[PDB]
Amino acid sequence: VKPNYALKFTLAGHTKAVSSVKFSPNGEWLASSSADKLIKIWGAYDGKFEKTISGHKLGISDVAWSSDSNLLVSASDDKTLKIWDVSSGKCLKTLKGHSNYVFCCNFNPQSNLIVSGSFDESVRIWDVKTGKCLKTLPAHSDPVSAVHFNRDGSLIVSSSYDGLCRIWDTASGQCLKTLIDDDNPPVSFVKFSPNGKYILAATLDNTLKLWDYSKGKCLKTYTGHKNEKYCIFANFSVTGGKWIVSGSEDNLVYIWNLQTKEIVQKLQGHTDVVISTACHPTENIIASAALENDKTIKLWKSDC
Amino acid sequence: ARTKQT
């Protein structure tokens, strides 16, 4: 079994490098963020441009959806996160507290909380309703590259240029685990598996690893792509075959068989680094996005 | 931003 992703749409409109693309949990929408300070919303199935959401004073590195698909949070170089009402485009809350660029953000499954990671080396936990910062974790000793809640939100995984991946107890802020590796290249990306048992970690030595969280053990390695420079998103594709999906600094989307670790597909089309990829929640649809020689988002669909 | 290498 191999996928057969084919190009469906190319979405143009951002005026600088695109930073992050995410499908709404209800599958209806794609949100994108960019160095151009804008969020844009697009129909997931027809690629139709819906609206632009603006307000950040500097470039945006990440965006994330609430569980009901009604809210977005964005993380910006302006040191803030913003919570947006997607239907109105209005900024509901500006989340202030970070002392440097906000790099990464996610809601928890209940979506009463938001977690953020910053160049200021901290992880913050925010109350969605009030916009107040509930906890500041002294998480790392370099910029925080990624933050992600597990399946029920009880845990937070973070990664950093300090070479570490740490797991945090959401309720107490306490560190449950630091992943044990003999070496410490920058960790550029981390995410829980959908069942919360595994962690997918990227390092800037062209390497993705699947870690068993309970055992503290590396189970799988995925290679062949280029990743030495940028914090590139990776994914679990679960709708058809069980794949790992990543962007690449050679302008390609890479798809691996999760279990065998074989490259099953490489998607060509982009004309710059593929910084971000996202997997649709119910269909075999990938969204990919690229840096400033390109500035487009591509939507791809497979039979499996 | 994430679009510049750091």
UniProtKB/Swiss-Prot annotation, chain A:
GO terms for cellular component: ATAC complex; histone acetyltransferase complex; histone methyltransferase complex; mitotic spindle; MLL1 complex; MLL1/2 complex; MLL3/4 complex; NSL complex. There is a cross-link at residue 16 (Glycyl lysine isopeptide (Lys-Gly) (interchain with G-Cter in SUMO2)). PANTHER family: WD REPEAT-CONTAINING PROTEIN 5 (PTHR22847:SF560), WD40 REPEAT PROTEIN (PTHR22847). Changing residue 119 to A: Significant decrease in interaction with KMT2A. Disulfide bonds: none annotated. Changing residue 61 to F: Strongly reduced affinity for histone H3. The record marks 77, 103, 233, 292 as: Important for interaction with histone H3. Changing residue 210 to K: Loss of interaction with RBBP5 and reduced ability to stimulate KMT2A methyltransferase activity in association with RBBP5 and ASH2L. The modification N6-acetyllysine is found at residue 82. Its main location: nucleus. Contributes to histone modification. May position the N-terminus of histone H3 for efficient trimethylation at 'Lys-4'. As part of the MLL1/MLL complex it is involved in methylation and dimethylation at 'Lys-4' of histone H3. H3 'Lys-4' methylation represents a specific tag for epigenetic transcriptional activation. As part of the NSL complex it may be involved in acetylation of nucleosomal histone H4 on several lysine residues. May regulate osteoblasts differentiation. One of its GO terms (molecular function) is histone H3K4 methyltransferase activity. Belongs to the WD repeat WDR5/wds family. This is WD repeat-containing protein 5. Changing residue 233 to W: Strongly reduced affinity for histone H3. Changing residue 292 to A: Strongly reduced affinity for histone H3. No effect on interaction with KMT2A. Keywords: Acetylation, Chromatin regulator, Host-virus interaction, Isopeptide bond, Nucleus, Repeat, Transcription, Transcription regulation, Ubl conjugation, WD repeat. WD repeats lie at residues 13-52, 55-96, 98-138, 139-178, 182-223, 226-266, 269-303. Interacts with PAXBP1; the interaction is direct and links a WDR5-containing histone methyltransferase complex to PAX7 and PAX3. Interacts with HCFC1. Component of the ATAC complex, a complex with histone acetyltransferase activity on histones H3 and H4. Component of the SET1 complex, at least composed of the catalytic subunit (SETD1A or SETD1B), WDR5, WDR82, RBBP5, ASH2L/ASH2, CXXC1/CFP1, HCFC1 and DPY30. Core component of several methyltransferase-containing complexes including MLL1/MLL, MLL2/3 (also named ASCOM complex) and MLL4/WBP7. (Microbial infection) Interacts with herpes virus 8/HHV-8 protein LANA1; this interaction regulates the MLL1 histone methyltransferase activity on viral DNA.
